[PDB]
Amino acid sequence: ALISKKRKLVADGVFYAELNEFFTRELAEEGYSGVEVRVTPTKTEVIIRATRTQDVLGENGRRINELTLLVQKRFKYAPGTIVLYAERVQDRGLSAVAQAESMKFKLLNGLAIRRAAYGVVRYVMESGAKGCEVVVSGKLRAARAKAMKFADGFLIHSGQPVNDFIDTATRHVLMRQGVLGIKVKIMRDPAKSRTGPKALPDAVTIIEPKEEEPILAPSVKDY
Amino acid sequence: MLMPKEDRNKIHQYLFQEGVVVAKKDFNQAKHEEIDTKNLYVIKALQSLTSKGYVKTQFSWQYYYYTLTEEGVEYLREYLNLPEXXXXXXXXXXXX
Amino acid sequence: GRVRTKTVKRASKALIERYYPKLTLDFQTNKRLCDEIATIQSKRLRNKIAGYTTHLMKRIQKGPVRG
Amino acid sequence: VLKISTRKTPNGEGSKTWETYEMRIHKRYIDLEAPVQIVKRITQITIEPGVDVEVVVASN
Amino acid sequence: GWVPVTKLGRLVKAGKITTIEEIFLHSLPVKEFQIIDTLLPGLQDEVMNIKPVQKQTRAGQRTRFKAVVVVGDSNGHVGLGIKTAKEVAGAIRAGIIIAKLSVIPIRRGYWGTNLGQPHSLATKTTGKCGSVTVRLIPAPRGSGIVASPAVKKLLQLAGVEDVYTQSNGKTRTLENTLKAAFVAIGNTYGFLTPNLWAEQPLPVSPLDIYSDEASAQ
RNA sequence: ACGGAAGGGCACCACCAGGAGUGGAGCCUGCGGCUUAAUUUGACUCAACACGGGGAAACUCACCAGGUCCAGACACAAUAAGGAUUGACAGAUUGAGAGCUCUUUCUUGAUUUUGUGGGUGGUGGUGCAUGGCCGUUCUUAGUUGGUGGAGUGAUUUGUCUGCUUAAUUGCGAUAACGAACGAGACCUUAACCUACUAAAUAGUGGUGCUAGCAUUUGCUGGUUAUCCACUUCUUAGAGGGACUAUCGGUUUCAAGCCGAUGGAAGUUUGAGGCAAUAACAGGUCUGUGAUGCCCUUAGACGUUCUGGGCCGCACGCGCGCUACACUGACGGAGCCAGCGAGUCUAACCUUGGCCGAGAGGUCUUGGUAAUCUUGUGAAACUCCGUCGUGCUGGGGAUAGAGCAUUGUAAUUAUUGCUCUUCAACGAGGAAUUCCUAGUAAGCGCAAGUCAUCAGCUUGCGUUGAUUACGUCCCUGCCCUUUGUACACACC
Ligand SMILES: [Mg+2]
Ligand SMILES: [Mg+2]
Ligand SMILES: [Mg+2]
Ligand SMILES: [Mg+2]
Ligand SMILES: [Mg+2]
Ligand SMILES: [Mg+2]
Ligand SMILES: [Mg+2]
Ligand SMILES: [Mg+2]
Ligand SMILES: [Mg+2]
Ligand SMILES: [Mg+2]
Ligand SMILES: [Mg+2]
Ligand SMILES: [Mg+2]
Ligand SMILES: [Mg+2]
Ligand SMILES: [Mg+2]
Ligand SMILES: [Mg+2]
Ligand SMILES: [Mg+2]
Ligand SMILES: [Mg+2]
Ligand SMILES: [Mg+2]
Ligand SMILES: [Mg+2]
Ligand SMILES: [Mg+2]
Ligand SMILES: [Mg+2]
Ligand SMILES: [Mg+2]
């Protein structure tokens, strides 16, 4: 124990990234979106968000148990003081990673370049998003490499709200010839934000007045 | 990989007593973390294994993650004892 | 230089038209009036509007302004 | 303010452009004087991810 | 549901206009494609072509798709729609809309003996969409539509049974051939034969009859 | 798309008005060339050349001379319990306590050896097969629907004469109307807050206890809590604040520009982060357990070990550093920063005490840190004194001798110290870089690197200006007009 706070919080941020990488490799076929981490008075809670929880929370505690024991050994956790949890997802249509990997698998499952694109696009779009852009680079029709952009809806690119509302995911897909790139972008709806601002930082809304029939000639009411 | 059997035992006892292996990509380490044999051993002991089924391999941030499959634990029940672990049960909590 | 953008002026016209009695020639009161009858996502913007809206008023009240 | 400053480029080609990242670490302390039940309750009732917590005995 | 934005559509939405001939008669335009929708359902649609065009941007290039659609029943009404957009599907749809707002009437007639329901054309008509001209000549029964595949489909959906075609100019630019084939059979209701010599007294146009039911908000 | 055509604009990677220099000198440093057993390699106009975070003594490490090792998975098949196979003391042998090879003879037991198949690796090739990232066009202002207008059509208009702006920024003109991306908004950081909530890890007033000069009460200190009160200074939460406000001059008396008044702040408040469409065979397979294909895989291009090399020097070139002194040098003395960093199963920042001319040594100490280092007592700078224009005490190259520090290891000098040697350089040809306010310039400092080594970089603050408040003359770009026989688009 006994580590500089400056070094610890970093050292932690390292851990997160090392976990998040791992779980992306192992649990890719389960649609893993991401993880949270929680230091508590005893017990550390690794929370796994995946759209196929049963292949994670496995054969009655199994599988996730491998995944716990795989951890206690790595980072030298005394058993029990760390406990892996399982989530489903907050609608996979809104998560770039779950989508990114979907383009990967779909392409891996032999699908058509343009079809894989639009089919992802249309899932996000019909998941209540504000827009979606999927960009595949690589060797599409072989030889001289090109890049294709399939977008629908609305995006921004510019300042801060790019970090608020849109999250992206770049995934490497290994193919028959070389490799292709899968950059999925998903701009969500500020109207449903919940935590953060509920509009673009330049959306001006004006509440409409009221027709009036003035005069009325003075008068007064007593109680 | 050469290696004696009394070193090849502890590896397979540990690969089932815990059911999973720490690994780490570092040859010339001499002695694992648990397993009192070469870290080179443990790795190339489980390179033969996963190369013939039994256990699955995963590599990230200079660390293999050796996970034992289904057909594996049956290569153990012949190589070790009995027929009636680790990854199958045990539920902690200090209960206090 | 200092040229006010569309989103600014677009709002001023919109505000002025449906709130001329409510608004004055004074920046600060108008500035406040914006928090009631409009929902602006930042302070600088809100002031910038409040500032141009107050600008038109100070010439509206000297003759009708083109738009 | 943690500061990591490097080149945007891999390899070494192009204008000599630099990037600079930050990590912002925020600290504070509160002092309490309370016994048996209020001590173990407050360490745990107030808990939240990302927020590191620590309580100290006293003296030395 | 379709919410009318033109004086025309209201009368059509309400039921105060029941057939399309009412419009052609008073030469009213048509701006809402739903008007003709209601007025004429079961109006089949064939897309005849999709050739890609390309452009040059302040940089490299710009390539996009062009749809040509004909629409019609097969009982006197036809439409031709040219639309080019950023994707196949949308370039088509819009074309179909544009084909329907285009829809036109056709004076079908007897080649000779008037024994029972027209089969060819009133007269010879001809049209010319830049360089390409198509000519339509009345024909005996059984003669059929003697045209190129793309002109025949058009005249089919136009509800024609037999006709003769002479064609001139570069009829390989499919777009222009059709547009003249279109300008052709549209002109059949321009040719003043001596049966239209009779004097009628001019109807008063549903815009004034149902003026009230045509007014808005 | 282009043009050695026209009109407009914008830009200190343009010029005007100037500042500071660079190009001359020596040294540092990268590139070429040359040399070499090797002097590994990428990159070549802006957009290659203190760039590859490339400050390489081993390592790194890819190159050069040599020696080991399999970590050649598994599967089929062959030999082998009359033992597949492993290891090694000695000596010979080798840089070598390598049993690598050999002489003798023990050992050890199905884990290995042989072969085919198939695989594992490679800083081996391919950035002209890719990704990912990045540079560049772009300090630029551009891109795109719907509906309507024009044209057979590709297209066009919308997306514009003028004016305005840093801006397709806006007013307006308007066969267009209404909108989305980019710009703007947004975010960060720096400025104001005697208004709020707080503070022994931040300060201040008073109070004890105590020191000294004065003694007329006073002035100046010490005390980690003596005790109390507070939040001005500090820190950071919550908000406030500016909108170019107010008046005035201009102007389609429109967008706006200018002036003066106040204001913490009136150049997009300063400075950044982010940043559309489309594109380049721009760089990177030597960042990657990212990657296609080729190559090689036990006389290995794999890996490790010993030593050398990347730094080799007739010379070309670029980035720098230190200078030519008197607005200086040297010696005393005054003494003021901000951004930062720091030791767990560990030896990081280090006060203080002693020792040592120094460099450094030794015994202790505090600190995982607003708490200890540290008020980081930094340099420029300020005062006083010496020197007195002389290649001088300016300048500190080259070199000799000695002492220490890092490291296994310092020779081809790692660095630091001390004495001695005292070079070129007397303001730098033709050319040419960078800049408009706390800026330029000067000054040093922390951080990256790092065992040691900064003449490099990323930031920081200290001292602090002259000149502009402009224009298209030069050089780039951008829109429009125009020509085209270009479209792989003036390579
Ligand atoms: Mg925007
Ligand atoms: Mg911006
Ligand atoms: Mg002709
Ligand atoms: Mg000049
Ligand atoms: Mg010079
Ligand atoms: Mg020089
Ligand atoms: Mg070396
Ligand atoms: Mg070596
Ligand atoms: Mg190698
Ligand atoms: Mg390239
Ligand atoms: Mg614009
Ligand atoms: Mg205190
Ligand atoms: Mg006090
Ligand atoms: Mg003033
Ligand atoms: Mg390299
Ligand atoms: Mg070198
Ligand atoms: Mg001197
Ligand atoms: Mg002095
Ligand atoms: Mg001298
Ligand atoms: Mg360097
Ligand atoms: Mg022209
Ligand atoms: Mg032309």
Closest CA to C22 of C7, C32, C10: C32
Nearest nucleotide over every DNA/RNA strand to the C31 CA, judged by C1': F243
> Which residues fall within 8 angstroms of residue C29, CB to CB, at 6 or more apart?
none
Task: Give burial (CB, 10 Å; 0-12/13-18/19+) of E124.
Answer: middle
And the tokens for A154? 């609305």
Q: In whole angstroms, how far apart are CA D31 and each of D54, D55, D57, E181?
A: 12, 9, 11, 92
Collect all residues of chain A within an 8 Å Cβ-Cβ radius of residue D43. 41
In angstroms, the CA A118 to CA C59 distance is 54
Parallel/antiparallel/unpaired status of strands D18-23 and A146-153:
unpaired
Classify residue A162 as left (phi > 0), alpha (psi -120 to 50) or beta: alpha
Which residue, among E93, E179, E78, E85, has the nearest Cα to E128 in the 3D structure?
E179
- Please state the separation of Cα E111 from the chain's center in Å: 22
Helix or strand (DSSP H, E) at B5: helix B5-17
CATH architecture of C6-61: Orthogonal Bundle (1.10)
User: Using alpha carbons only, what angle is made at residue B90 by residues B88 and B93, rounded to the nearest 5 degrees?
Assistant: 145
Domain boundaries, chain C: 6-61
Helix B5-17 to helix B39-50 angle (10° resolution) is: 70
The answer to whether the CB atoms of B67 and A70 lie below 8 A apart is: yes
**Structure-block tokens of residue B25:** 């990509």
Residue identified by tokens 């815009």 is E207
Residue A127: count other Cβ atoms within 10 Å of its Cβ: 16
Q: Is the dihedral of CA A97, A102, A104, A105 positive or negative?
A: positive
Rounded Cα distance between A177 and A142, Å, is: 8
Query: How far does the CA of D53 sit from the C1' of F203, in Å?
Result: 28
Residues 131-170 on chain A lying near strand F, CB distance under 7 A: 135, 137-139, 142-145, 147, 149, 154-162, 170
Per 3-state DSSP, chain C is made up of helix, strand and coil in percentages (nearest 5) of 60, 5, 35
Q: Which residues of chain A have a CB within 8 Å of the CB of C10?
A: 204
Main-chain dihedrals φ then ψ at residue E153, nearest 5 degrees: -55, -45
Token match 């029940």: residue? Answer: B77
Q: What is the dihedral of CA A96, A101, A104, A109, to 10 degrees?
A: -130
- Cα D60 to chain center, whole Å? 24
CA-only gyration radius of chain C, Å? 11
3-class secondary structure per residue, chain D = CEEEEEECCCCCCCCCCEEEEEECCCCCCCCCCCCHHHHHHHHHHCCCCCCCCCCCCCCC
- The answer to whether B52 and A40 are in contact (CB under 8 A) is no
Which chains have at least 3 CB atom pairs separated by less than 8 Å from chain D?
A: A
Which tokens in the block code for residue E119?
A: 């089969």
B14 vs B9: CA distance, rounded Å:
8
Whole-number distance in Å between C9 CA and F248 C1': 25
Kindly give the distance from the C-alpha atom of residue A140 to the centroid of ligand 10, in angstroms, as a whole number.
17
Single-letter residue type at E68:
V
Is C37 close to A203, i.e. CB distance below 8 A? no
> Strand pairing of E45-55 and D18-23?
unpaired
Within a 10 A sphere around the Cβ of A160, how many other Cβ atoms? 9
E131 in contact with nucleic chain F (CB within 7 A) = yes
Q: Is A49 helix (H, G, I), strand (E, B) or coil?
A: strand
Rg (Cα) of chain B, in Å, rounded? 14
* Virtual torsion, Cα E160, E187, E173, E102, nearest 10 deg: -80
Rounded to 5, what percent of chain E is helix, strand, coil?
30, 25, 45
Residue A143 has which token pair?
């030889």
Q: What SS3 state is found at E53?
A: strand
Reference A165, options A184, A183, A191; nearest CA is A191
| β-strand partners of D10 | none
Find tokens 């290994």 and name the residue.
A174
Q: Rounded distance, CA E115 to CA E93, Å?
A: 40
The full DSSP string for chain A is ----HHHHHHHHHHHHHHHHHHHHHHGGGGTEEEEEEEE-SS-EEEEEEES-GGGTS-TTSTTHHHHHHHHHHHTTPPTTSEEEEEE--S-GGG-HHHHHHHHHHHHHTT--HHHHHHHHHHHHHTTT-SEEEEEEEE-SSSSS-EEEEEEEE----SSTHHHHTEEEEEEEEE-SSSEEEEEEEEE--GGG-SSS-SS-TT--EE-----------S-----
- DSSP 8-class letter at C40: -
Question: Nearest 5°: phi and psi at B49?
Answer: -55, -65
Beta-carbon contacts of B52 under 8 Å, excluding residues fewer than 6 positions away, are none
CA count, 13 A, side-chain hemisphere, A58: 14
At A83, is the secondary structure helix, strand, or coil? Answer: strand
The span from the CA of B78 to the CA of E116, in Å, is 95
How deeply is A64 buried, as exposed, middle or buried, from its count of CB atoms within 10 A (0-12, 13-18, 19+)? buried
Which residue from B52, B53, B14, A11 is spatially nearest to B23, judged by alpha carbons? B14
**Minimal CA separation from D29 to chain A, in Å:** 14
